[PDB]
Structure formats: structure tokens, C-alpha cells
Design an enzyme around this catalytic site. Structure first.
Site, short mmCIF file in Angstrom:
data_model
loop_
_atom_site.label_atom_id
_atom_site.label_comp_id
_atom_site.label_asym_id
_atom_site.label_seq_id
_atom_site.Cartn_x
_atom_site.Cartn_y
_atom_site.Cartn_z
N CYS A 2 0.77 -1.23 0.00
CA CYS A 2 0.00 0.00 0.00
C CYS A 2 0.81 1.30 0.00
O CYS A 2 0.36 2.30 -0.54
CB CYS A 2 -1.04 0.00 1.15
SG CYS A 2 -0.39 -0.35 2.82
N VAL A 47 0.00 4.27 -2.59
CA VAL A 47 -0.37 5.60 -2.13
C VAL A 47 0.54 6.69 -2.71
O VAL A 47 0.06 7.76 -3.09
CB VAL A 47 -0.36 5.69 -0.58
CG1 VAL A 47 -0.58 7.13 -0.14
CG2 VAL A 47 -1.46 4.80 -0.01
S1 CLF Z 1 4.97 -2.46 6.27
FE1 CLF Z 1 -0.64 -4.12 5.48
S2 CLF Z 1 0.12 -6.11 4.69
FE2 CLF Z 1 1.17 -4.41 3.60
S3 CLF Z 1 0.05 -4.08 1.71
FE3 CLF Z 1 -0.55 -2.60 3.32
S4 CLF Z 1 -2.42 -3.59 4.22
FE4 CLF Z 1 -1.31 -5.29 3.13
FE5 CLF Z 1 3.86 -3.00 8.20
S5 CLF Z 1 2.38 -1.29 8.42
FE6 CLF Z 1 1.34 -3.02 7.42
S6 CLF Z 1 2.66 -4.83 7.61
FE7 CLF Z 1 3.22 -3.75 5.67
S7 CLF Z 1 1.11 -2.96 5.29
FE8 CLF Z 1 2.98 -1.30 6.21
#
Ligand code: CLF
Ligand code: SF4
Ligand SMILES: [Ca+2]
Ligand code: NA
Lengths: 522, 476, 286, 289
Positions: free
Chosen positions: A152, A156
Site C-alpha cells: 500500500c 499511495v
Molecule cells: S509495512 Fe498491510 S500487509 Fe502491507 S500491503 Fe498494506 S495492508 Fe497489506 Fe507493516 S504497516 Fe502493514 S505490515 Fe506492511 S502494510 Fe505497512
């Protein structure tokens, strides 16, 4: 304390009196815990219809979802191609999670890389991460193909995959002929199955978009099969077995069965089997293309129909009796091969099993959840068994899908008490099994918390969980099962009736109380 | 042979393109027990090179999954798209006692499930509405935390304002945590970001409250997430010693225990990496001193009990010796049974930020040797505490790459490997006994005397299992 | 069957008027069409609906818990000749990415079943002033295969046309989106038709039609309608019918060759729109 | 200290020539000013540098894979009156975001110390055609504190002025951004000044200045310069000096009150610029009436 010859792990160690007194003191002295009678009062309120109404009017909060995000599906799809390394452009945290999630379900290694975009890429993009990433990945893990998807953060900020890869090649970070199909997979759009669809169409367009003038429909005499997000090894297997059994030439596009089941013989195989690059290039030359899970292969379908010119058959997932029959008949029609005696006999054996177990299955009520195709296939088979699918929940389902399921239900008297829910989660489902209690729940491991919750209200309110779906983390090797075809129907039927008989045995095991019905024969 | 290890390192590095090669070379080293300033030998806490398959997680994992997730009576919102919260739901065994979904909420996954329109318009209004919904459906929650996922900071949402406004409106503690995954380079910054969030929004709540009756033996367990019950099997010993454990950070922890911590007399730090931040702050602000301890294995546990007791009067020191004498025959029986089955076996470890060095003593108590160890995200002050614990010429690896780990293991040929879920199945296929050292492979506790028995039993069942003699078909 | 087209162009040159009259002409000749407005001004369907402003999907989506709470019925409106109309709308000023708002709206129409198997055409009326990644998303996401650029014989409108061609070239090596031609909305400049044909030639495309200026357009608009509906006998009506027919029979879909600023200025000078620059005075006074 | 201002307005109404003529007026006046060009289609430094086109950050940043390689003097150029100029570089057609292209510039300037307090004024020249998150980055990142909107006495120009005002309002309660006034670039239209004045009154602001249409403006432009430099004795020169003086002394910084489309149309109709619609005839064919 421990008795060396009978060591206790957390359970039941903490049940010892000294631990119990210690926990009581911790609570009373520093937790400022709500009184137990207040906890009972609120718990009870959470099982009511009043609470259920408040629960269903939620508009912003989601609790215990029954879906994951796009890239998880892109990684699984990529995993099904020969010597292909799934690569997710974006933040590395996501990759640690995707791997771990699949590692626990398959109990197998899951290879995937990230290009670790960090804070300094949040402002100006991750073009450099892509250049160094592809170079380091190819050099270090030696894949013959790198399939790119995104997290994401990259979505973004607008990183342009196409341009980033082109530049990596233009500047020599990876060979210009090195295959790098890609797909934008935003986690805030659809769900993990959407990521599978996006990744697949991306790989399909990469190998055929620019060379369509070279293709001739039906020239290779095969039938393409696109499986979609699939986590049961027996499903890839049963499809290949039935087609080979029919003498039908075919090509399974995205086949991870070998890489998700390597032998423990002394060596770790990062890659194994998979759809070859040649099979993707040649795919347009097939007689047609069959989509096993059409409800999450819509983008793929548009590309296959619009560009390959294949008259994709309107077939439901091959689950249950009618739909497996339809799949075989359509495959027979497209290939010109008759359905062989062996398959006809297998069909009749499933019907025999249905006649033998119908008395225990009749009228049994179920609550169930999962992906759209899987859910509707389960619903159709339950109806065929004379069971009642009362609470049908598909968090990542959509309006058109719900209408299709409502039509399937209207076609059977056994579908009269069923309600299809889309956009709802497992906290919504929890209320449903308390207010309109079914006999069992058919779902993934997250359902164990609902069973625990219903038992707390009372043994007579407990709704046992029957594990079918994804992910299944608290039982071993169920990922080797089958849910598709006659073979999958036989397995599901066996699992359902024996779940019913196991519970009945539990309820009649009371000495001189309920054991008058503890029958040796059932 | 130091030469052989240095050579192994260089051989492995050859597959890398120039940039990655020069960088990775600084994160691999041959141990020298004499070194006290680890930087002279290995660098750490730097970004991971792209495409090399680091085993590291993100800041969200370090804040939501590690520090905040365990607080049982608070509701933690995984703020952003559906992914993060789902993969981290109940994956870490931070045990607790409670009525889940009613007064406790650890195993549940609360999320704002961002859709495309939330990215376009921002999620502050959704957050505000979500909070009212949480309050309506979970009235017994005693506080809410907002764990930011990647998109929050990228789209410019103002979760601090929302928390302040809703917090005052509902007279509820609402903690905004900026642990977006793109911050930092691993789980580490997540810890620091989380410690600062506790400090700024929770810890000073009772600064002017004097209703808590304190005693001179009040301590707090800092940095024990009660994996498989680890903290409870630690707590029991401290209290048998006469001390009073006011709080547990954060395994089986409650928001009230945290708010009560500034009233203790000593902070007992187990996980230095994740909570040294808040520990230094408590000393600075409340004058509470803190000390590091280790409850892995009888040697380290006895040493820790004695060091902690020395901080109090003679009555505690007396009880300390009584506790040590009570358990002596129990761990001696464990050693008597299992050491002869593990004597001399070599182990290679790879974990997060504490255990890679903290468990060495326990392995040695069973006559085992740790020939290699490394951390996913430790800092140099962690390696400073590591070199003296490892033998001369053993291998060290920081943010090891999948490729590196596999190659080191093929050359070194350990009798057992202790790492994570992403590593487990790789080595089992190679015929090398493997034990998960994060989740304890669904076993545990491993801390304290009761935990030592389990640890021994586990190392033995796996290392000497009959399955390891069957990987080669006899027709081969 | 169903052809996906996008009308791209600078603002302020009658692009929306030309789009709605082109669509009304197609409906008039028997085609099934859907108009999807993708301009933040949300003024791509008023002439078809005889309305002052159609509720946009973005406006309604901001008020709801989830976009699925919205009903196609409040979003999609049937107007003249049965053509279906939708306005994507944009996020509030200063906050969102207008482009992502447009994709959100189109994704909604897709899921809601708005694209009937009946449809012959779907026309996206998209803004083309600044051709950023946002406004270029309908292209990047294969939402439309045929791009028709509305421009005029002036610097900025032509400059916009070159930028849109650049956008197309950006995704051409990985998708099927192509430039089907230029549509010159006449501003009555002298040799305007020649100048756009010249630009088309350099871009490698064609000037599919020259839409002359006619005040019948304004007399129709003051009644909130297209010329096709207001005065089908009008000569301008036939101008739009010819444009419609030519799009329907169009087979020229290419990957353009954007020109340089120099090339553009040389062209503007070749037709008097711009004059040679006396670089001797550049930096003088009195 | 430093006054960080921004000139916002739709394209094609001469906003950039006004920005540069304004800045030149502040320089001959003795103010140290820097122009940060944020327009993709209207180079904001061409008249100050006599150049034909100034190299942009984004453009020169491609010439090194990253911006961490550029040199302050490759980007920041000085021109007439010593005002310093920098062009962000519009978004690459089809893939870039104008909002990140700005953020790029700001950071490079801030770190090269070209954003210090030796400057009396900073003026971000930004396009107001579409007021999205990208183009409102100078307001979002609280760098533009005083906004002046260049507009004209016609629908689109006035609609854009109202759009920008809406963006200003969204961040007004988060930071110090404010609307300093409306600058009317004349189109020689009858009662134009009164119309923009009425618009300013409704928005809660003021029409800080009416910039006349004058041919010396164009004579100066072809010579790639401002009128302040080309002919400092020209009448138009004093127009810019007055606008410059009013900005320097301006004390009216407000949170505007955007109007409804109905109000805007009523205003234009009140002035006779917009024809009044006969409702009874809406949707009726020529043959029916
Ligand atoms: S580093 Fe989350 S798993 Fe991702 S693509 Fe976004 S929804 Fe899916 Fe850490 S905070 Fe989270 S786990 Fe990644 S997404 Fe960022
Ligand atoms: S991509 Fe374009 S529409 Fe989106 S925020 Fe940036 S400039 Fe605005
Ligand atoms: Ca396995
Ligand atoms: Na209540």
C-alpha cells in the site's frame, strides 16, 4: 514446580495452586479489573438480539475480518510459475507477514522478497529500490522470472511499476529480455483474491499482449485452466487427475502444487514445478480457457475473452455434484473427449455416499464463511445433501455475487432459511450464531474463538467448528485435502457427517444419563 | 578456525552485486570474546538491502504486535487497510487471563479496513466514528490505541487531533501511535515509537495520585511479553523471593498496572532492546533505577535472583537463598536427565533483539554449544552485550539474508537451529533439527526454573527425534 | 462489442459540449451509450439530463460508511435518447487526489453492474489540463481503449494535446490504450483546421473532425440541451452527426509521437498563431 | 523574519506575468525575494532571468537518478534585482504528481540553506486550475502562509478563485494559512473591477489591486523581462509598484467564506455577463417554442 518425569507446559502448569494464587493476587492488587458479575452481565448482553442490531449498524469499525489484502494473493499466484520469485515492491513488513501466513497454513517454506522502501522513499518514490532490488534478487536467488506486485505504501505514493522496471532494464540492472511481469495490487481495493486476479492478468498480458497476431485459437488442442487463489493441494491435483483421466490436453496456468509440497530428503528446493513461461506464451493457442473460481477472475476473464478471443464457458466452481457434472460435460464438449467410465463410476460412488448418509445430514443447520467461489460451492453442495445453509457470510463478496447465491438458494426448498451477508465480519457472524443458533459452523481457524464464546454461554449453546477454508493453522496437514470435484465432495460429505456423529457421541456419553442413545451402530 | 569462518564469509559474499556485497560484509563477523565495542567488528540497525530476502518485519509489528498488542484490557485498532491486522492476529503467544470480547481483547483484530475512498478523503472521520462504535460494542474496554499502518502518514491524516478530541469527549484514554511500516528499518523503531507513546499518553496519568500504598519491595517486570506464560513463571520466583510485582510490561499487562509503574522501587528489565527507552525515562522522571536480568536457564536465573535481591535488604537476600534451595533439586533433575542426551551438540541461532544472546546460558546448562548467532534488528549496544557471551571464533550475523543463512548452515552443519517460522521448514528439509525460538514451537514457558524443564524436554525431543535418521531413501 | 472511449482535453474550449453532442448524436442513430463524467467540475451530463448539476459519486460516497451503501439508481440517470449519465465528482478541494476519486467512481460502476451487455459505447469525459499520474489513471487502468483529444488552434490547448499523447505513449508498451484522433473545437482562428491537421500529422494521428463555432450551440445550452435534441435540423447538428459516424467507423488507433516544444513553436509560427522571436532585443530597455 | 506567500490562479489569464512583475517591484524596492515555480504550463521565472526556459528540479533530477546529487546553483538562479528563481518541474505527463514535485523542491531548498532568513519574501507561483491534494501541497505543508489569488472578471477565473478559497479553508484550522486578497488581471471588460470587488466582499477578503491591460506588458514579455525592468517609467510600472506596496503592508489575512455555485451565477447574472435562463423553456425543442 515441575516433576522431572512429567513436565507440564503452560497448560496445565498454570493450573497448579501456587500459580493460581499468584494470578489471583496480580488481578486483585493491580489490574483494577471489572467485577466478575459485571463481566457476566456484559457477556450475556453480547449474545442478545439488541446487541446484534447495534452490531449490524456498524459503519466504520471492522472486527475479526474474514479476508486479507491483495498482495497476499499476488504472491500465491506468482508462486505457481516455474523458477519464479514473488517480489513485492514496497515495505518489507508486508513480506514478513505474507510468508509467515502461508508458512503456518502449508507448513512449508514460502519464498518472496521485498525491495525495502523506507521513509526516504516515501517522498520521492522507490525507483532506486526497484533497480537495486531486481538486480540483487536475480543475482542472489537466481530465479528465471521475477513477478512484481505492490504494498500500500507504493500505491499511495504513486510509484509507476511499468516505468520503474523499464528504467531498471534501460540502465542495466537486469537483462532486457529477463521476464518481469507486474501488477498494481492495492490493499485498500477488494481483497487477497483480487490480488491473485491482478497478478495473473499481469503475467498473462506480459507474455501475450504484443504477439497476438502469431496466435491461432485451438491450434494447440489444449484447454487452459486458471485455478484462482487456491490453498488446498488436492484441488490442483484432482483437476489434473480428472483431465488426464479423460485424455484431455490441458495447461494449468499458475500451478504451485510442487513448490508447496517438496519432499524432506536432505535438500531445500527454493523452486519446484510450476507453469512454464512457454505455457503462458502458448496459452492463446488453446481451444478455450476455463476459470475455476470466476468470481475473483473478472479482470483475467476480460483479457482472456477480449484479447485471446476465447469463449470462456459460464461455469460455476466445480464443487458438489451438479457443478462437477457441468464442468466435465463442458470440458467434454470443448475437447471432443467423452467422459470415461471411471469418472461416471466415481460420480455414482459419491451419490451412493449421499444416500447412505442423508438421514444424519437432513435439516442440519450451518453458518459458514470464506471466499466467494468457495462459499457458493459449499452452499450448493449443502443443498444437494438436504442441509440448511442458514448464515452465509462472505466478507469480500459483492452485490452481483450475492444475487447469484440468492438465486441458487431460491432453486431449493433447503435454501429457505438462508441469508447471504456481504461486507460483514466474524464479529457479525458471532451474533448470528447466538441469536439464530445453527448446529455447526464451517469455516477457518478464526472460527475457534466463536466456538469458545458460544460454549461460555452454555454447553447447550456451543456451536462446533468444522474446519474447511483458509487459513487453517491449528490442525496439521489439512492443506493436503480436496474440496473440488467428486473427490472433494466425498471428503466434505465424510467430514460433515462425522462431525455430526462426533458431537452426538459427545452428548450421549453421560453414564446412566444420556448414554441410552450412545449407539454402537449409526 | 577463525580463518575458515572469515573465508566462509567471503565465499558467501561473492554472489552479490558490488553495492550489496560491500554492505553485507559489514554485517557478518567472526566473534572475539575480548571485544567490548562491537562496532569495531560488526555494524547493525541499518536499512536492509533491497531484494535480498531479509527476515525482518516493520515498525507496526514492533509497536502493535510487540509492545501494545499484549495490553489485555485495551482495544488496539490496526488503522489502515485490512492486511496488517489480519496477518498479525493471534500470531504471537503473549498470554493473558481474561474474558475475550468482554473485558480483554488480545486475540481479536479491530481494524478501520481502509477502502479506496478512505485513501482519497482521509480516514479521520472514519476513525472518530469507529471509536464511538468501539465504545458502544465493547463498553468494558479501558482504553484505546490507534496503531497506524503505512497509509496514515502518507495521506496526511491527523490521528493525534482525533484522539485528543474523542478522548476528552469520552473521558477515555486514546493513544495515537505513528508506527507506520515505512518508518525505521525494522521492528526496532516500532518499540521506540511505542515506548514514547506510552510515556506521552499513559504513564503520567497518576503523577498527582497518592492513593496507591507502596512497599519497599515493589518492582515491575519490564520487557517480558509472557510468551507461552514466560512472565508468570518469572513472576512466581520474584514473589517467592519476597518482592511485590506491581506491573508486567506488557505480557498479561493491564493499563492500570502500567499507570501504577511510576510508584515502584525498581524496574527489572528483561528485554533491554524493546524497553530500555521507557526505563531510562522512568529513572529520569521518577528516580526509579533499572537493571538488566536473565531468566533463561538455572545459572542465569540464580545469578539474576541474587543480583536483584542484593538491591534490597537482608530479608530479601535470605528469601532469595531459600528460593534457590527449593528449586535446586528440580533443575538438577532436569540436567541429570537431559544433559547426557544433548552434551556437545552445536546450535546456530537467529532471532530478534534479545534471545540471540539471552538463551546461550540455558543451552550451556545442558552442555550444548552455540556456534553461531545473530539478530534481525539488534543495535550495537546489543552486540556489545553479545560478544562476551559467545565463544571465540563463532559466527555472528546481523539482518542475515536467506541466502547467507542457508550457506552458513551448509558449511557449519549445526546439530540444531533455533529461529523463526519463515526459517523452520527450510532447515527441516535439510535434515537439521529445528526449534522455533520466538513462539517456542507452541510449547513453553521457557523462563525461570519451571520453564527450564520444558526447554530441556523440547531441545531433546527435537534434536534426538527418530525422524532425522529417515530423510534418505534406502535405495539411494 | 462495447467500445470504451475517453474524451481528453484542456478546459475552457467546449470539450464537454462537444462530448455531449457527440453522444446525443450516437443515441440518435440507434447506439446504446453511457456517459461517465471525470471532470472535478462535474458538468459532463447536464445537456443530456436538462439539469443544473448531477449528484456525483464522490459527493455521495463521502457521506456514507462504504461506497457500496450507494445505489446505482441515485448515481446513474437516463437522459435524452436513453443515454445513461454518471458524474464521478472529485474529493473536497485541497485534500484528495482527483484522479483516485475518478478511479473509485469507475470501480463502483463496474461492481454495481452499470455496464450492461447492451451498451455500444461508454464515453469518459476526462480533464486534460495538467496530465498528471492522477488524471492519467483511466489510461493506466485500461478503463478506455480509444482516446480522442479535443483541442483548438491555440498554444495551451495544443500543448495539452501533446501532453495527453505523452501519457498514452507512457503506457503503450504495456497496454492497448491508443490515440484515435484529434477533434478541433473551432475558436474561429484563421487557418485553424490546417494547423490541427498539421499537428495530427506530426503526432501520427488524424483530425477526425473540425467542429465549427455556431451560436446555435449557445441557444441550445441556455435551455440545458444538446443541439441534436434542441434543433436536429440545425446545420451544427449535422456537424456532430458526422463526428459520431466517423468515430463509429474509426479504425485509426495509434501510439502517438509527441513533438518537442521547439517543434510546437515552429508550428505555431508557421501559422501566425505565434511570431518569430527577435533575440537581439531579448533583455533590452530604453 | 520571512513572509512565505503564494500566488494561485487558473491558467491563461496572465497570473505568472503578474507574479514576476510583482516580485520585480518588490526587488527594485529593496526586498530579497525568491520565486518557487510550481506551474507545469507557465514558467514563472522566465521574465526575471531573461531566459527562454529555466531548468527544473524534476528535470535535472532525472539527470542523476536522484535529487541528492543536484547543486544549488544548477537550480537556484538569480536575476533582475537579485531575486532568486527555481522551477519545481511539472509532473511527468502521465505518471507524476504535481504535489510530490513541489515537496521535492522545498526539501532541496531547505537543505541547501536557500530557504534562510536572509529572504524577506518567498512566492510560490502555483496553478489553480484544479485544487487537489497535489497542488495544495504548499498550503498543506504550511509553507505558503499568505495566499493572493490572481483572477479575472469571468466565470472560470472566478470559479477557480472560489475553489482555491475552499482549499485555504480546509487547512485554515490546522495551520496559519490565510487569504490575503484577490488580484484582478484586467480583460478590459466593462465593470470588471466592481465585479471582482463584489466577489472579494462575498469571500470575506479584498481586491488588493486591479492590474490594467497595457501593451507595455507584452512589449516587455517578448524581450523576456518585466515591465519594471523594461521601462521603469511606464505607467504600468507604477501599477505593479502599488500592488507590491499593498502586499508589503497588507494586514488583512482571513479565512475566506467560499460561495455556492448558485451565488456565483447570480453574481455574474447581476452584472449581465451570464444570460438568465428561462426555466419554463428548459428541455423544450426549438419546434416546441
Ligand atoms: S509495512 Fe498491510 S500487509 Fe502491507 S500491503 Fe498494506 S495492508 Fe497489506 Fe507493516 S504497516 Fe502493514 S505490515 Fe506492511 S502494510 Fe505497512
Ligand atoms: S496525481 Fe494529479 S490529481 Fe492526483 S494529487 Fe497529484 S496533481 Fe492532484
Ligand atoms: Ca512441510
Ligand atoms: Na449494557
Amino acid at each position: 514446580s515441575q516433576q522431572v518425569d512429567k513436565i507440564k507446559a503452560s497448560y496445565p502448569l498454570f493450573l497448579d495452586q501456587d500459580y493460581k494464587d499468584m494470578l489471583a493476587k496480580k488481578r486483585d492488587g493491580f489490574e483494577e479489573k471489572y467485577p466478575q458479575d459485571k463481566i457476566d452481565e456484559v457477556f450475556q448482553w453480547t449474545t442478545t438480539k439488541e446487541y446484534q442490531e447495534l452490531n449490524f449498524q456498524r459503519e466504520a469499525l471492522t472486527v475479526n475480518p474474514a479476508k486479507a489484502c491483495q498482495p497476499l494473493g499476488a504472491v500465491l499466484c506468482a508462486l505457481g510459475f516455474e523458477k519464479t520469485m514473488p517480489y513485492v515492491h514496497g515495505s518489507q513488513g508486508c513480506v514478513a507477514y505474507f510468508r509467515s501466513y502461508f508458512n503456518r497454513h502449508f507448513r512449508e517454506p514460502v519464498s518472496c522478497v521485498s525491495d525495502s522502501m523506507t521513509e526516504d522513499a516515501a517522498v520521492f518514490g522507490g525507483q532506486q529500490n526497484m533497480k537495486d532490488g531486481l538486480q540483487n534478487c536475480k543475482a542472489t536467488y537466481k530465479p528465471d522470472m521475477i513477478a512484481v506486485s505492490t504494498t500500500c505504501m507504493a500505491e499511495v505514493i504513486g510509484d509507476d511499476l511499468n516505468a520503474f522496471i523499464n528504467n531498471s532494464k534501460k540502465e542495466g540492472f537486469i537483462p532486457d529480455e529477463f521476464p518481469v511481469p507486474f501488477a498494481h495490487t492495492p490493499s485498500f481495493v477488494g481483497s487477497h483474491v483480487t490480488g491473485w486476479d491482478n497478478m495473473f492478468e499481469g503475467i498473462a498480458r506480459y507474455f501475450t499482449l504484443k504477439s497476438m497476431d502469431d496466435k491461432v485459437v485451438g491450434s494447440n488442442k489444449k484447454i487452459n485452466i486458471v485455478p484462482g487463489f487456491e490453498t488446498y493441494l488436492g484441488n490442483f491435483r484432482v483437476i489434473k487427475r480428472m483431465l488426464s483421466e479423460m485424455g484431455v490436453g490441458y495447461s494449468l496456468l499458475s500451478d504451485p502444487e510442487e513448490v508447496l509440497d517438496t519432499p524432506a530428503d536432505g535438500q531445500f528446493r527454493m523452486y519446484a514445478g510450476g507453469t512454464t513461461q512457454e505455457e503462458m506464451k502458448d496459452a492463446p493457442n488453446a481451444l478455450n480457457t476455463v476459470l475455476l473460481q470466476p468470481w475473483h477472475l473478472e479482470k483475467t476473464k476480460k483479457f482472456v475473452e477480449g484479447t485471446w478471443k476465447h469463449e470462456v464457458p459460464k461455469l460455476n466452481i466445480p464443487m458438489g455434484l451438479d457443478w462437477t457434472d457441468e464442468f466435465l460435460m463442458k470440458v467434454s464438449e470443448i475437447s471432443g473427449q467423452p467422459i470415461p467410465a471411471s469418472l461416471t463410476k466415481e460420480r455414482g460412488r459419491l451419490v451412493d455416499m449421499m444416500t447412505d448418509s442423508h438421514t444424519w445430514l437432513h435439516g442440519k443447520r450451518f453458518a459458514l464463511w470464506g471466499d466467494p467461489d468457495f462459499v457458493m460451492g459449499l452452499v450448493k453442495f449443502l443443498l444437494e445433501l438436504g442441509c440448511e445453509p442458514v448464515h452465509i457470510l462472505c466478507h469480500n463478496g459483492n452485490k452481483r455475487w450475492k444475487k447469484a447465491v440468492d438465486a441458487i438458494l431460491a432453486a431449493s426448498p433447503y435454501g429457505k432459511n438462508a441469508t447471504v451477508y456481504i461486507g460483514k465480519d466474524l464479529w457479525h457472524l458471532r451474533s448470528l450464531v447466538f441469536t439464530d443458533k445453527p448446529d455447526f459452523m464451517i469455516g477457518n481457524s478464526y472460527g475457534k474463538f466463536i466456538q469458545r464464546d458460544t460454549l461460555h454461554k452454555g454447553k447447550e449453546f456451543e456451536v462446533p467448528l468444522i474446519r474447511i477454508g483458509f487459513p487453517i493453522f491449528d490442525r496439521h496437514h489439512l492443506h493436503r485435502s480436496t474440496t473440488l470435484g467428486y473427490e472433494g465432495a466425498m471428503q466434505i460429505l465424510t467430514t460433515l457427517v462425522n462431525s455430526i456423529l462426533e458431537r452426538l457421541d459427545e452428548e450421549t456419553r453421560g453414564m446412566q444419563a444420556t448414554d441410552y442413545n450412545h449407539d454402537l451402530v449409526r | 578456525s577463525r580463518e575458515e569462518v572469515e573465508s566462509l564469509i567471503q565465499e558467501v559474499l561473492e554472489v552479490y552485486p558490488e553495492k550489496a556485497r560491500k554492505d553485507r560484509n559489514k554485517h557478518l563477523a567472526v566473534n572475539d570474546p575480548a571485544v567490548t565495542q562491537s562496532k569495531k567488528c560488526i555494524i547493525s540497525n541499518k536499512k536492509s538491502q533491497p531484494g535480498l530476502m531479509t527476515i525482518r518485519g516493520c515498525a507496526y509489528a514492533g509497536s502493535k504486535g510487540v509492545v501494545w498488542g499484549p495490553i489485555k484490557d485495551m482495544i488496539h485498532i490496526s488503522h489502515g487497510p485490512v492486511g496488517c491486522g489480519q496477518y498479525s492476529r493471534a500470531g504471537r503467544r503473549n498470554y493473558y487471563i481474561g474474558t475475550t470480547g468482554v473485558n480483554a481483547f488480545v486475540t481479536m483484530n479491530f481494524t478501520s479496513d481502509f477502502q479506496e475512498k478512505d485513501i482519497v478523503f482521509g480516514g479521520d472521520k472514519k476513525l472518530a466514528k469507529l471509536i464511538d462504535e468501539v465504545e458502544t460494542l465493547f463498553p468494558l474496554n479501558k482504553g484505546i490505541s490507534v496503531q497506524s499502518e503505512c497509509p496514515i502518514g502518507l495521506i496526511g491524516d491527523d490521528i493525534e487531533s482525533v484522539s485528543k478530541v474523542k478522548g476528552a469527549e469520552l473521558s477515555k484514554t486514546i493513544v495515537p501511535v505513528r508506527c507506520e511500516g515505512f518508518r525505521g528499518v525494522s521492528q526496532s523503531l516500532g518499540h521506540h515509537i511505542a515506548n514514547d507513546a506510552v510515556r506521552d499518553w499513559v504513564l503520567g496519568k497518576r503523577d498527582e495520585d497518592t492513593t496507591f500504598a507502596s512497599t519497599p519491595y515493589d518492582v515491575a517486570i519490564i520487557g517480558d511479553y509472557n510468551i507461552g506464560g514466560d512472565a508468570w513463571s518469572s513472576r512466581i520466583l520474584l514473589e517467592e523471593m519476597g518482592l511485590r510485582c506491581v506491573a508486567q510490561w506488557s505480557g498479561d499487562g493491564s493499563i492500570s498496572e502500567i499507570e501504577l509503574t511510576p510508584k515502584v522501587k525498581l524496574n527489572l528489565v528483561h528485554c533491554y532492546r524493546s524497553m530500555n527507552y521507557i526505563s531510562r525515562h522512568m529513572e529520569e522522571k521518577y528516580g526509579i533505577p533499572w537493571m538488566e536480568y536473565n531468566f533463561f536457564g538455572p545459572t542465569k536465573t540464580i545469578e539474576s535472583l541474587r543480583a536483584i535481591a542484593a538491591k534490597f535488604d537482608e530479608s530479601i537476600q535470605k528469601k532469595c537463598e531459600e528460593v534457590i534451595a527449593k528449586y535446586k533439586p528440580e533443575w538438577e533433575a532436569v540436567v541429570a536427565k537431559y544433559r547426557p542426551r544433548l552434551e556437545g551438540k552445536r546450535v546456530m541461532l537467529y532471532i530478534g533483539g534479545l534471545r540471540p544472546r539471552h538463551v546461550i546460558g540455558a543451552y550451556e546448562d545442558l552442555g550444548m554449544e552455540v556456534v553461531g548467532t545473530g539478530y534481525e534488528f539488534a543495535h550495537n549496544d546489543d552486540y556489545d552485550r553479545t560478544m562476551k557471551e559467545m565463544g571465540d571464533s563463532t559466527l555472528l550475523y546481523d539482518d542475515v539474508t536467506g541466502y547467507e543463512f542457508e550457506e552458513f548452515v551448509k558449511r557449519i552443519k549445526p546439530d540444531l537451529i533455533g529461529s523463526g517460522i519463515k526459517e523452520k521448514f527450510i532447515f527441516q528439509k535439510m535434515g537439521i533439527p529445528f526449534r522455533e525460538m520466538h513462539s517456542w514451537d507452541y510449547s513453553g514457558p521457557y523462563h525461570g526454573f519451571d520453564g527450564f524443564a520444558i526447554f530441556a524436554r523440547d531441545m531433546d525431543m527435537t534434536l534426538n527425534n527418530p525422524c532425522w535418521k529417515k530423510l534418505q531413501a534406502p535405495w539411494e | 462489442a462495447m467500445r470504451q472511449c475517453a474524451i481528453y482535453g484542456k478546459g475552457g474550449i467546449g470539450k464537454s459540449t462537444t462530448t455531449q453532442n457527440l453522444v446525443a448524436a450516437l443515441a440518435e442513430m440507434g447506439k446504446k451509450v453511457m456517459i461517465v463524467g471525470c471532470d472535478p467540475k462535474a458538468d459532463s451530463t447536464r445537456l443530456i439530463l436538462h439539469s443544473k448539476a448531477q449528484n456525483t459519486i464522490m459527493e455521495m460516497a463521502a457521506e456514507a460508511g462504504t461506497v457500496e451503501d450507494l445505489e446505482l439508481e441515485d448515481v446513474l440517470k437516463a437522459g435524452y435518447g436513453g443515454v445513461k449519465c454518471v458524474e464521478s465528482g472529485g474529493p473536497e478541494p485541497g485534500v484528495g487526489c482527483a484522479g483516485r476519486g475518478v478511479i473509485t467512481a469507475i470501480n463502483f460502476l463496474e461492481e454495481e453492474g452499470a455496464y450492461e451487455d447492451d451498451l455500444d459505447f461508454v464515453f469518459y469525459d476526462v480533464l486534460g489540463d495538467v496530465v498528471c499520474g492522477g488524471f492519467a489513471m483511466p489510461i493506466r487502468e485500461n478503463k478506455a481503449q480509444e482516446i480522442y483529444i479535443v483541442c483548438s488552434g491555440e498554444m495551451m490547448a495544443m500543448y495539452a494535446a501533446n501532453n495527453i499523447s505523452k501519457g498514452i505513449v507512457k503506457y503503450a508498451n504495456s497496454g492497448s490504450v491508443r490515440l484515435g484522433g484529434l477533434i478541433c473545437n473551432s475558436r474561429n482562428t484563421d487557418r485553424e483546421d490546417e494547423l490541427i491537421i498539421a499537428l495530427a500529422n506530426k503526432l501520427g494521428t488524424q483530425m477526425i473532425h473540425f467542429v465549427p463555432r455556431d451560436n446555435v450551440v449557445q441557444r441550445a445550452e441556455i435551455r440545458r440541451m444538446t443541439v441534436i435534441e434542441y434543433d436536429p435540423k440545425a446545420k451544427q447538428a449535422d456537424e456532430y452527426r458526422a463526428l459520431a459516424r466517423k468515430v463509429v467507423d474509426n479504425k485509426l488507433l495509434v501510439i502517438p509521437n509527441p513533438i518537442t516544444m521547439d517543434e510546437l513553436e515552429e508550428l505555431l509560427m508557421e501559422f501566425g498563431i505565434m511570431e518569430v522571436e527577435d533575440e537581439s532585443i531579448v533583455g533590452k530597455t530604453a
